């Protein structure tokens, strides 16, 4: 299991207030210094914002106006919350921890999250079809939005070696599709996080 | 303008030693400067903090060093999962003075690799939906240039397939590409052979991969 698990909504529309949690596994909040950083697709990494071991709550000069930073110990979770969001707020969201309990420093964050997916845009979301690739075997899965990408595993983790999933692409109708491939001498997991849809398909000849 | 990284994107071969330098405006607090390693879709990863101390289970051919407002992440012996987008950042003592810098990209060359070609034709399920995705596969080639032509009876096919890339491989600095093709099932079934071309430097000639629609 990973440490930090980011939490949200996957795709929303603009003017809404979006809504992140940083959920911690295994250890208490109380303490505990966090670290919310941002990078919108092939940009750079921006700071947002932070909770130091002492609780106290530093806010880049941007997001000073625009975000609440907050702690709920009881449920073990971070949150971050993002008013009147915009085009410029869509990127991968990541929470990271500073081991030294600094709520505003970037040069040790030795823990991260895997980051959850933001893209803001006025269209609904839609799930996925996921179709086989029969004999290398794979699955397409395509016509799914917004943006943010499904995620595809095989054998429900077991299948690791000679997996290549690509990057998605953003087809004429502007829906998206993407492909996973394995080469072999079979159930590929989709999850689309925004649609909160989840399909096992299985490939065969 | 607060932290610059240089150069913005370099290249090298595999045992290769290549540095890249950060320059922030202030001078850095108590030593605080960080390196960051960032792999195609993964979150960044804290290789050096403190200037020059490695992150354990960091491979030691990893090393960081500067002073002030110059410091520099050299990689002795450059390695395909090396693969990356490296940034600094840097802690100027106190609230709001940090930022990241800028990043930078490294690539990996390595010797000619031709691809492995595979066709999978449109299944049952999605030709009940009125569409047809035929779609070819090049496999664990190099460099990335490669051209991908889609062939129906033999007649040429433009504007009707999309394509995408994999980033070099972490063990192999190969690439991976995918070809999909796309028309509605009225188009697909008036027509028999489907066939993906592929040109690649490591191919003597183009490998074409069909299959009979039945």
């Known amino acids: 299991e990973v440490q930090l698990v980011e939490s949200g909504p996957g795709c929303v529309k603009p003017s809404e207030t979006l809504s992140l949690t940083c959920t911690v596994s295994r250890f208490s909040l109380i303490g505990y210094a966090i670290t919310w950083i941002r990078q919108p697709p092939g940009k750079g990494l921006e700071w947002i914002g932070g909770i130091s071991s002492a609780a106290t709550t530093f806010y880049s000069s941007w997001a000073k106006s625009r975000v609440t930073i907050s702690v709920d110990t009881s449920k073990n979770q971070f949150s971050l919350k993002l008013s009147s969001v915009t085009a410029a707020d869509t990127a991968v969201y990541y929470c990271?921890?500073?081991?030294?309990?600094?709520?505003?420093?970037?040069?040790?964050?030795?823990?991260w999250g895997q980051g959850t997916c933001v893209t803001v845009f006025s269209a609904s979301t839609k799930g996925p079809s996921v179709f086989p690739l029969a004999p290398a075997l794979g699955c397409l899965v395509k016509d799914y939005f917004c943006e943010c990408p499904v995620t595809v595993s095989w054998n429900s983790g077991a299948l690791t070696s000679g997996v290549h999933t690509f990057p998605a692409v953003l087809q004429s109708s502007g829906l998206y599709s993407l492909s996973s491939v394995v080469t072999v001498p079979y159930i590929c997991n989709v999850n689309h996080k925004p649609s909160n849809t989840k399909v096992d398909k299985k490939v065969e000849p | 303008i607060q932290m610059t990284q240089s150069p913005s994107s370099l290249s090298a071969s595999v045992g290769d030693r290549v540095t890249i330098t950060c320059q922030s405006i202030?001078?850095?607090?108590?030593?605080?400067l960080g390196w960051y390693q960032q792999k195609c879709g993964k979150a960044p990863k804290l290789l050096i903090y403190?200037?020059?101390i490695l992150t354990s289970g960091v491979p030691s051919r990893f090393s960081g060093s500067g002073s002030g407002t110059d410091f520099t992440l050299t990689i002795s012996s450059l390695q395909c999962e090396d693969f990356a987008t490296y940034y600094c950042?840097?802690?100027?003592?106190?609230?709001?003075?940090?930022?990241f810098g800028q990043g930078t990209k490294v690539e990996i060359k390595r010797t000619v690799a031709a691809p492995s070609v595979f066709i999978f034709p449109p299944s049952d399920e999605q030709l009940k939906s009125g569409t047809a995705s035929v779609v070819c596969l090049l496999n664990n080639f190099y460099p990335r240039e490669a051209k991908v032509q889609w062939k129906v009876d033999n007649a040429l096919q433009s504007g009707n397939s999309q394509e995408s890339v994999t980033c070099q491989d972490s063990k192999d600095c190969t690439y991976s590409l995918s070809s999909t093709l796309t028309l509605s099932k009225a188009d697909y079934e008036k027509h028999k052979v489907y066939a993906c071309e592929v040109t690649h430097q490591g191919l003597s000639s183009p490998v074409t991969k069909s299959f009979n629609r039945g």
């Open positions: 403190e200037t020059s």
């Open positions: 202030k001078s850095v607090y108590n030593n605080r």
């Open positions: 990271a921890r500073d081991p030294r309990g600094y709520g505003a420093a970037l040069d040790r964050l030795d823990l």
């Open positions: 950042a840097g802690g100027f003592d106190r609230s709001g003075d940090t930022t």
